[PDB]
Ligand binder design. Structure first.
Ligand SMILES: [Cl-]
Ligand SMILES: [Cl-]
Length: 308
């Protein structure tokens, strides 16, 4: 095997997490199990769980209110390779983003693959944003300014959904920022995909292939511009993007390409690589100060756009 371990290059914090640990419904229940510890001791706050209609049927949302009033609404799309996760697996991340931005965070429990396929989760997200834009007063929201945020597959969904709003001309509020932690955006291969990914992070080429084959309707979708975002128009009208990457993540090149593409067209963005980290590190704030730092950095980016 040409890939070498990244263990000795990981930060002390990251190494501590690696030392701690370690059918589809069963895999989902194990993911809930692995995630439960990391979501403990999350910021206390008001929360409402609301069913929202979509073209596919209702989708559950959770509204986190860190203060009684809000000056923007941040929609959060969780990771899990399109096949795992829910609002509880990312509860702490969402509560912390709400605390740090001072704004309502709305988590979307989008339909998982392989039962759902692309672009269902995007369409559900758009339906949710449209619903809350129409019912803002009822839910005590400020929908004049909105953002999207997500980790891993959720970062894919966040950017894809914002591009869908743009491309289909759907008005849901001014999209002031998109917060993207270690996303994938359509690369099929790359330097980092060949150097990194293994048993330690569950991101071998084989794993990445499996997630894709669960998500797409068929192989033609690999080129669709809301899956391979690099096939969309990234030369204009892209909302400001905060692009965070993990150093030893096979997906880092997807973030680098997104950054470099937006830069080439003077599209607004910030890029930051978090040194010594593996993919998925945003979940480990209870043990890793850098995970909390990455959440704060994204929150600061969002807040700076509530103004400018
Ligand atoms: Cl499924
Ligand atoms: Cl870069």
């Amino acid at each position: 095997e040409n890939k070498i371990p990244v263990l000795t290059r990981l930060s002390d914090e990251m190494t501590a997490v690696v030392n701690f640990q370690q059918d589809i419904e069963t895999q989902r229940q194990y993911y809930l199990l692995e995630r439960r510890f990391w979501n403990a001791d999350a910021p206390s706050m008001t929360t409402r769980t609301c069913a929202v209609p979509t073209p596919y049927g209702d989708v559950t949302t959770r509204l986190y209110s860190p203060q009684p009033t809000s000056q923007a609404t941040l929609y959060y799309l969780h990771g899990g390779g399109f096949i795992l996760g829910n609002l509880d697996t990312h509860d702490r991340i969402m509560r912390l983003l709400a605390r740090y931005t001072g704004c309502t965070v709305i988590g979307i429990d989008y339909s998982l693959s392989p039962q759902a396929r692309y672009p269902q989760a995007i369409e559900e997200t758009v339906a949710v944003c449209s619903y809350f834009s129409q019912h803002a007063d009822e839910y005590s929201l400020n929908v004049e300014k909105i953002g999207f945020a997500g980790d891993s597959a959720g970062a894919m969904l966040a950017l894809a959904s914002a591009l869908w709003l743009r491309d289909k001309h759907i008005r849901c509020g001014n999209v002031i920022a998109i917060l993207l932690w270690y996303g994938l955006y359509g690369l099929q291969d790359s330097v980092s995909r060949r150097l990194f990914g293994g048993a330690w992070d569950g991101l071998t080429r084989e794993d990445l292939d499996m997630y894709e084959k669960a998500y797409l309707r068929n192989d033609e979708d690999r080129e669709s511009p809301w899956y391979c975002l690099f096939n969309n128009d990234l030369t204009r009208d892209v909302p400001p993007c905060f692009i965070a990457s993990a150093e030893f993540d096979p997906l880092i090149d997807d973030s680098r390409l997104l950054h470099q593409t937006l830069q080439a067209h003077q599209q607004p963005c910030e890029y930051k690589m978090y040194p010594g980290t593996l993919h998925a590190f945003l979940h480990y704030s209870r043990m890793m100060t850098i995970a909390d730092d990455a959440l704060q950095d994204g929150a600061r980016f969002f807040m700076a756009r509530m103004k400018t």
